[PDB]
């Protein structure tokens, strides 16, 4: 990890991040065989088996009822809309009787059967038989003459184990209207997610990467309910495909550049903050806060959300002092005193009335910070304080640089009117 502090705009760029980026969806369709519970009867009064059975019947009937500029908001909107529409489009195929019978037929032999829908998309079918196996072979042997208060209570308490997966799936599709937000352990076991990766058409290196970051695969992917067919519940799991991998990414972060340029303040904050990556030889900006997260050196952004932005846009990092690109900023008479915890150093903004200090555990206050923007590396301090607040800095080791240049709020005269603006190019504002 490497980080540059831009004095020009009280902003950092943290370079060095590699990339994992969701380009596609791999669909894993589960046939959880519930079995024909809808007619099983207990003639034996209230019983442990009976209430498990009646929960199982009710869950099935319940599941049969359910069925499917400020860049941040639009990036969030398109990412969710594209994801669900991609899944629904596959649901529209696999819901047809021609496809359900095809999927169920190949699953008759082996609990995994790769198959191609009539609509041409390839799918990994899998079958979860363990509930039907218990009901049809174990439980049906126990339930003599429809008596269900059998004394071999092991059957009832173990029934209450097998149905846990089924009942949680009915919950999660119910509470999410057939479209879950994540692939719970109940929709797809860690074993089945590992099988899904090792079966998916991607490089073995990414199979190892995804096996090494299974929580990421699980978080970005999501489940869709197809429906109950013939007392069997059909649902599809969209695992992410990470086509773009280990390309450069960087996170851009900023705090208010201000100076008392006329005794009154003028301030500037970059609005282009957040993750940027190179994708197939175009830069892409990921503004929506749900898009990106980092496990180690990778950032796992989603390419549906990313607004493409010209390669020239990096010139806001090199020289916003000179660039002809319209670097999007906000400005005004609004000095805010704050810290922004970049991975390799806190940005610190310190204006009127607010004392600012940095410290360490062994030695207390190291220094009282100056007025204006200050950049405190992970190695300069352990804490930074703004008024009485205490902000603990990151302790990540990495390379940090200053890039010199009198901050834009100090080196340009602010426009006299309108002196406050939200989310505008610098050309409009200084």
């Amino acid at each position: 990890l490497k980080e540059s502090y831009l004095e020009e705009s009280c902003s950092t760029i943290t370079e060095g991040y590699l990339s994992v980026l969701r380009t596609g969806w791999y669909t894993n369709v589960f046939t959880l065989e519930v079995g024909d519970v809808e007619n099983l009867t207990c003639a034996d009064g209230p019983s442990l088996i009976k209430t498990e059975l009646d929960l199982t019947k009710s869950a099935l009937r319940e599941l049969r009822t359910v069925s499917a500029f400020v860049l941040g908001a639009i990036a969030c909107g398109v990412a969710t809309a594209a994801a669900v529409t991609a899944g629904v489009a596959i649901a529209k195929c696999i819901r047809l009787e021609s496809e359900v019978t095809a999927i169920k037929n190949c699953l008759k032999k082996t609990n995994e059967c790769v198959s191609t829908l009539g609509c041409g998309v390839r799918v990994l079918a899998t079958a979860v038989r363990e509930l039907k196996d218990f009901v049809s072979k174990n439980l049906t042997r126990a339930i003599n003459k429809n008596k269900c208060d059998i004394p071999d209570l092991k059957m009832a308490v173990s029934f209450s184990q097998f149905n846990r997966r089924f009942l949680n799936v009915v919950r999660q599709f119910s509470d999410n209207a057939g479209i879950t937000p994540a692939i719970s352990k109940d929709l797809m076991t860690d074993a089945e997610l590992a099988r899904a990766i090792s079966n998916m058409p991607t490089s073995a290196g990414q199979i190892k990467l995804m096996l090494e970051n299974r929580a990421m695969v699980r978080r970005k992917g999501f489940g869709i309910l197809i429906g109950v067919y013939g007392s069997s519940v059909i649902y599809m799991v969209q695992l992410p495909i990470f086509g773009v991998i280990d390309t450069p990414c960087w996170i851009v972060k900023a705090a208010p550049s201000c100076s008392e340029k006329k005794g009154n303040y003028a301030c500037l904050l970059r609005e282009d903050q957040g993750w940027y990556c190179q994708n197939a030889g175009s830069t892409v900006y990921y503004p929506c806060e749900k898009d990106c997260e980092t496990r180690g050196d990778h950032v796992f952004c989603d390419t549906a959300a990313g607004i493409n932005v010209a390669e020239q846009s990096k010139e806001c990092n090199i020289n916003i002092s000179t660039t002809n690109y319209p670097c999007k900023v906000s400005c005004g008479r609004h000095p805010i005193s704050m810290v922004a915890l970049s991975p390799l150093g806190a940005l610190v903004a310190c204006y009127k009335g607010v004392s600012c200090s940095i410290g360490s555990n062994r030695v207390g206050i190291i220094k009282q910070l100056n007025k204006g923007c200050s950049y405190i590396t992970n190695q300069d301090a352990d804490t930074v304080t703004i008024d009485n607040t205490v902000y603990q800095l990151s302790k990540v080791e990495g390379e940090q640089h200053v890039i010199k240049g009198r901050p834009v709020s100090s080196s340009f005269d602010p426009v006299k009117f309108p002196q406050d603006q939200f989310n505008v190019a610098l050309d409009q504002c200084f």
Partner: antibody
Amino acid sequence: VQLVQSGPALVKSTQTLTLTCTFSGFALTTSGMCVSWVRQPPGKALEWLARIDWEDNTYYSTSLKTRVTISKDPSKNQVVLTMTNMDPVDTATYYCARSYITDWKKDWFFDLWGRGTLVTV
Amino acid sequence: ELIQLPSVSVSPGQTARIPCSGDGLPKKYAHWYQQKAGQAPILLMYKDSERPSGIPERFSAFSSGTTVTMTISGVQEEDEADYYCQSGDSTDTSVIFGGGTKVTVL
């Protein structure tokens, strides 16, 4: 719903018998259905031969499993009985009969019965 | 093996009781059948004492456990038939018919 049989009514000794039974108004593939064959000699008790179910699992009568074999024809709505080494003692009426149990699948009653085909040997 | 009495003799208006005895009957249902001479058999009880539609209300069976006894009250010439009880074997992997019982109505 209907069951109809078509013999043949005569099979030579030691040959292999085959009998079709044909059905309508339901399919063997819908759950909890089966068909069975049940034998009955003239003036004698009934004797279940085999059953084929909605999963095409076949259960053969332990006295006759060596020789009886009964299966669905996949393309068409008929079952065929087959059983080797027809003896004269096999001379009997043969009935297909239909079981439909949607509850626990344990205790099979047959609730529709064919007219039954007389086999002579 | 489901034991049944080989024949029972009754006059019209009596009540005919046909016992079916079998080791599985504490554990399996005993279904019941009726065969009029040269007719296809029909089922009379489709559980121990559940009765199909159209089968008359005077057909019912008494007991669950070591013996299931099937009883026809008002027994009359239209009931003169051979009556078969049947059950599964322990594994449910076979169907076992009883020996039948000729009801003779005189």
